[PDB]
Subunit: 132 residues, 4 copies
Amino acid sequence: STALEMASRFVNRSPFNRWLGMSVLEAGEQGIVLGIKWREELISSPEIRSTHGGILATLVDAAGDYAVALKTGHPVPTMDMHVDYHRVATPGDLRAEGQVIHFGKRFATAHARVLDMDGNLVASGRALYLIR
Amino acid sequence: SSTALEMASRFVNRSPFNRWLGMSVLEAGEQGIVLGIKWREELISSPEIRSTHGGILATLVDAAGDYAVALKTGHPVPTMDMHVDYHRVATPGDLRAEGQVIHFGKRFATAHARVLDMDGNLVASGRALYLIR
Amino acid sequence: MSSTALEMASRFVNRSPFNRWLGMSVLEAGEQGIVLGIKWREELISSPEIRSTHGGILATLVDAAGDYAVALKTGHPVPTMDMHVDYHRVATPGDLRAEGQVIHFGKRFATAHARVLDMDGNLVASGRALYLIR
Amino acid sequence: MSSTALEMASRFVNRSPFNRWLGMSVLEAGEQGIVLGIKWREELISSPEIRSTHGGILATLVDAAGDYAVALKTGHPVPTMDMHVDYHRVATPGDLRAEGQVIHFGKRFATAHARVLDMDGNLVASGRALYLIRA
């Protein structure tokens, strides 16, 4: 609630997030849940109408970032990121769940799951952030 | 070659996201691929340093490795997984992505990529595994 | 969890000379996933200043845990395609534990996650890996 | 030159009991980066049917190559933040070479890439790693 408000503010600061219609669905002790709204510009392969792998990477990076932000009180730079692609993401809205896995004095690690509308896992990933 | 450059442009322009990125092919040959994209305000992550979103750099790492593999296969290829290192903040400006195939197997390939800004500064690098299929 | 899972994984673990050198064993095996243990030895050391366990050993643990967690589902050990490992804390001299878990299980590929713990239950490393099912 | 570099890297390599157990040596060291070798042993084996070298060994090589490529620039070995390794080919029984080189070198962080080769020069694995300049 406090955490949800704080996360929303962070999310709305970024023009890319806004272009993605990104929102906060949940925030608290279990990390963060994000949503984005689908548009035709997201499409990678026109024949399968698949959402671009980089959009999914965005969601992994965002989920981990703002999940760390719940602990720091501010958004954090990404050092590096890994993303696994599991299923093709057909046209529709997406959810990214983000949890902090390690929180040190200067670095944090977060994990993320990206889910489709039926709750199928389409991608997962992890990232290292800088605490500054 | 011009045939390589030809083929790659065609692949690049299939994708609506590529086109929204103003993505173009700068070079294509035995040396791999070089891509460009055109900056726009919607790319911005932190409004105060005007940095290009990390997901955009990842897109570029993914695209460069994809289309570099595609030069060898003749068709675009699905990404299995990807890694990206962020080295410098990318301030507003067009970006270049260089992709090369590192391993070309019978069913998979891995490519490495570098993302450069307008002064040729390295801003990000990465690798990815692709499914031939 | 299972005794059949425990017997199966235990057989898989003991097939490897490197696992045996590491004194690797199966602590837990079942539906949730797998837990492995290794026995510390002086040869594992990276830095003699801090007597730290080499990061290559921590990565070996991430790959093993993921492999055997996949293996509980396929019925056989699996080749690794790639892996990522994150290092959080120095693993000082002491036995280590690795928890493995299957994240996605397709007909042809599987992804697993791991956590490497010290004897006090502090997380020293974590990671993920892609495996091929053939 | 590539003599002070060799001797410096050699000192770093031999400081580790795990490196010594692996029979690790420095083959090349200079401005372009580092080349390491290890000696094969039966204990290295993963699959006894294939007689494949364990992937943990190949990952140790990615990490070592990168660390010592950075160390040639800092003057000291460096801790690893994280690592990725890609496995391309089975490493059958035999000695292995690892080439390491720095990709980005910053105030506080450095990134390095590695290639693991068999005795015929086939690429067995590759990967990258992030290091902390400090400890």
